[PDB]
Amino acid sequence: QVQLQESGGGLVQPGGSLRLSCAASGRTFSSYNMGWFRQAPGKGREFVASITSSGDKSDYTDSVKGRFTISRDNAKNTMYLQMNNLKPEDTATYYCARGLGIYIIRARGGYDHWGQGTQVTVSS
Amino acid sequence: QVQLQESGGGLVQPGGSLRLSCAASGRTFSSYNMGWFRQAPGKGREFVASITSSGDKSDYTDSVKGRFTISRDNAKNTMYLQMNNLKPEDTATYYCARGLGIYIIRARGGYDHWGQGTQVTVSSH
Amino acid sequence: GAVVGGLGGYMLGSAMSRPMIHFGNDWEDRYYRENMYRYPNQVYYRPVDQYSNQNNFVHDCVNITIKQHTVTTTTKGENFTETDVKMMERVVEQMCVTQYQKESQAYY
Amino acid sequence: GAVVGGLGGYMLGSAMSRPMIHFGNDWEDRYYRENMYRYPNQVYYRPVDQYSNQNNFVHDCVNITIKQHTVTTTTKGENFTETDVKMMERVVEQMCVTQYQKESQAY
Ligand SMILES: [Cl-]
Ligand SMILES: [Cl-]
Ligand SMILES: [Cl-]
Ligand code: NA
């Protein structure tokens, strides 16, 4: 079915910024909630942020609130994650995924169709 | 025309509670936003709280936030104001009014059809 | 598990004794005691291994439990006020924290 | 006066120079400067005598000014982001405070 591909990762200094992109194949992008997870070395995937199919509502984990901003362009079949004020502990592989059901949640089990992931390294 | 009548005022000690009621005559109650103002001795009417026609959103002046709760029952043509943790400086005449336009605002000019008002006295004497 | 909003795998915890919240004024204390029977006494949650910290587990537990409780009750005609919602959030969160530490006992 | 949302009596202040807000990171500073042309530079308000304190005047000024700016513009296909709104709130509040103290000197 639909395939998700993350892009935009790289190296940034602490305090710097990056914009991540999640591109979806197919034509049903705007009918599903979407979210971002991340996985730091030696840990599992953790919820980062989510957004409803229409973009009217969003959710963020406590450690990224006020620094990260999720959004989506239903015309371009793309979701975005704008990351500012990056920290060394934001270093992780970042995944996008498609929400299951009509309620954006934070559990790993609330999403499927995980992309392959993109690497974000925050170091000087 | 449509008439509004406040009730429920009275004397209460500080820390106490009162529930005000605004009853509307007529046939269009649920089509209009509604609000509450109050007037203390020697002062003019000031905004207290407001609520949209459907009740989906509300607004409060800073001095009552977390203490007062506005609500409405469109079936009963009645709006309510629940006041808890009352203070002596909540003493005032309380007026209900019908919103003008579609946006609940805090200006005196955002409302008309002012009721006659009900007196709330917060003291221990 | 149970299905909420088109997503399965939710767990339903056993009925819990609803706590007695003191709000700081007699009126709200009394309103809660007289209305708590209309509020949940068991919470929907997902297994702890699907989360990386307590807050996210509890946030889901509160959000989903209140969402599903609103659906089921609004079939019986009930209608929760702004203050019903505030009080439900406080009691459900307490029960979700208790559920979390109860599920946590298996993971260590 | 002007009519916003079916209510007349609103005042429209004169065009104002939008302040240059520093947010604490380069990205948002640059985004604001590059997008501020799409934000109001005049505020809708009501006469000060309709309020009893500055906060309520400014709250109305911010709320109404951003609402009407969205109405008029979002007809041109404009789509304000969740972050455009935050920046509009910060700039409009600053301009509303300036308008308030400016109206207050007459009272
Ligand atoms: Cl893959
Ligand atoms: Cl009148
Ligand atoms: Cl261990
Ligand atoms: Na007026």
Author numbering:
A (entry chain B): 1 to 124
B (entry chain D): 1 to 125
C (entry chain A): 119 to 226
D (entry chain C): 119 to 225
Cite, word for word, the article reporting this structure:
Prion disease is caused by the misfolding of normal prion protein (PrPC) to its pathogenic isoform, termed PrPSc. The host-encoded PrPC is a cell surface glycosylphosphatidylinositol (GPI)-anchored glycoprotein containing a flexible N-terminal fragment and a well-folded α-helical C-terminus. We recently reported that an anti-PrP camelid heavy chain antibody or nanobody (Nb), namely Nb484, inhibits prion conversion in cultured mouse neuronal cells in a dose-dependent manner. To understand the structural basis of Nb484 mediated inhibition, here we report two new X-ray crystal structures of mouse (Mo) PrP•Nb484 complexes at pH 6.0 and pH 8.0 resolved with a resolution of 2.1 Å and 1.2 Å, respectively; and the crystal structure of the nanobody Nb484 alone (at 1.2 Å resolution).
The first high-resolution MoPrP(89–230)•Nb484 crystal was obtained at pH 6.0, and the structure was refined to 2.1 Å resolution. The second complex was crystallized at pH 8.0 and determined to 1.2 Å resolution. Both structures contain residues from 118–226 and the average backbone root-mean-square distance between them is only 0.609 Å, indicating that both structures are almost identical. The overall structure of the MoPrP(89–230) in complex with Nb484 consists of three antiparallel β-strands (β0: residues 120–122, β1: residues 125–130 and β2: residues 161–163, human numbering, for the convenience of direct comparison between Mouse PrP and Human PrP) and three α-helices (α1: residues 144–153, α2: residues 172–190 and α3: residues 200–226). Similar to the human protein, the palindromic motif, AGAAAAGA, of MoPrP (residues 113–120) adopts a stable β-hairpin fold to form a three-stranded antiparallel β-sheet with the β1 and β2 strands. It thus appears that the MoPrP structure also adopts a more elaborate β0-β1-α1-β2-α2-α3 fold than the canonical PrPC fold. MoPrP(89–230) interacts with Nb484 through a discontinuous binding epitope comprising residues 123 and 125 of the β0-β1 loop; residue 128 of β1 strand; residues 164, 167, 168, and169 of the β2-α2 loop; and residues 173, 174, 177, 178, 182, 185 and 189 of the α2-helix. In both MoPrP structures, Nb484 binds the hydrophobic domain at Gly123 and Leu125 to stabilize a third β-strand (β0), which forms a three-stranded anti-parallel β-sheet with the extended strands β1 and β2. The β0 strand in both MoPrP structures (residues 120–122) is shorter than in the one reported in human structure (residues 118–122). The crystal structure of MoPrP(89–230)•Nb484 complex clearly reveals the stabilization of β0-β1 loop and β2-α2 loop. The MoPrP-Nb484 interactions also significantly stabilize the β2–α2 loop at the C-terminal domain, leading to a rigid β2–α2 loop.
